[PDB]
Subunit: 121 residues, 4 copies
């Protein structure tokens, strides 16, 4: 649990997700994206399942990054929702939703969707 | 921005979402689902845009709930991703993602997608 | 099942969705968006469950619109995926996905997600 | 356009998507999934952009499969929404929504989301 997820992961875009698993389920750390209106690190927070199953299933988790730091504000936030798989090629497989603040008139087009896969190399 | 988010919020299912918005952009609270493999409050955390634009744009935000508490463990996690719209009929408009831990053969079906709209009611 | 789907349907944006449901499970028609880079009818096609269960369950269905007609080309496509619920206040409840053609560097942001609920109005 | 997309593709699960691009934008063919309540082929229909851009961007497309054939009915339908990329390693990169028919009471959990990548080998 804690041991697996805690640390540095990298997705297929080159972004760098540096997280610490609390013992109770807390997720805390930072996020630097390779693309988008984004530069340097951003704060992130979320949760994972701290007593996950033994049947060889992944560990369900989820975190969120609001795209504002000491450099820029993108008026957006994405949530990654996924599950952590251990073993030889450990991965965190996710899908995500990026909502950016709009007027009610562009609400229809406020949310992008996607998938990021995170490995340790 | 920080008063308008903070407090109790109810989605279209009857779920109760109690959240505190810090001044940095941090979200903390509890979520209680009306539906699903859930009962009582579950801890939540998220992030939001503490400097949203001043143009009638909503305020982007995310948060996560891992469906484990003292009472049960659904081995799953939801992230909600949307925007907050203040004023007379303030709402929090989300789309969400729920991943449950599955086996590798079952990963293709591990994730539900939906939308929740929250009102102060 | 085939009468209840066929006809004119309006989402929460004012868009008009004219569809014919064949007896095999086929959907044909036109879609006219109230929003976006669109104007006049666009051709649509989809599929539905022509033997939905008899247990109060809705009727699964999908359809696609490529945003090219005689008038303009947004180089993009939406699929709607939901269920039809008959009776007094019949609705078609969708979530949708809109992909626009992008470059490879831009693929991560090529896809919008949303929901549309259709009423006979 | 037509030339690229028309034919046989395979996703990362082993499913077999056999499609024909109309000259106007029509998509027609069959779908055999490796997983899920699915056996043999199912009819599919959809649309792609028939005059796509020249700037090296993908071709936006979308299709739908209702999971009923002469063998079984899964009371579900998925829509794939994505874009076709030509060149050496041609791919159709998609995300999808599988909605299954539910009572209004399980509507919240009626729709799964995912991503399939289709290549020619
Ligand atoms: Cl279990
Ligand atoms: Cl993967
Ligand atoms: Cl600002
Ligand atoms: Cl809405
Ligand atoms: Cl049946
Ligand atoms: Cl709804
Ligand atoms: Cl162009
Ligand atoms: Cl890919
Ligand atoms: Rh258990
Ligand atoms: Rh991929
Ligand atoms: Rh600004
Ligand atoms: Rh809504
Ligand atoms: Rh049946
Ligand atoms: Rh709704
Ligand atoms: Rh053009
Ligand atoms: Rh993948």
């Amino acid at each position: 649990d804690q041991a697996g997820i805690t640390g540095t992961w990298y997705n297929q875009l080159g972004s760098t997700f540096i997280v610490t698993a609390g013992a109770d389920g807390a997720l805390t750390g930072t996020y630097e994206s390779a693309v988008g209106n984004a530069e340097s690190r951003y704060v992130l927070t979320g949760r994972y399942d701290s007593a996950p199953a033994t049947d060889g299933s992944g560990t369900a988790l989820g975190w969120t990054v609001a795209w504002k730091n000491n450099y820029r504000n993108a008026h957006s936030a994405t949530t990654w929702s996924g599950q952590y798989v251990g073993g030889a090629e450990a991965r965190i497989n996710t899908q995500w939703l990026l909502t950016y603040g709009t007027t009610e008139a562009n609400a229809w087009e406020s949310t992008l969707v996607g998938h990021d896969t995170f490995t340790k190399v």
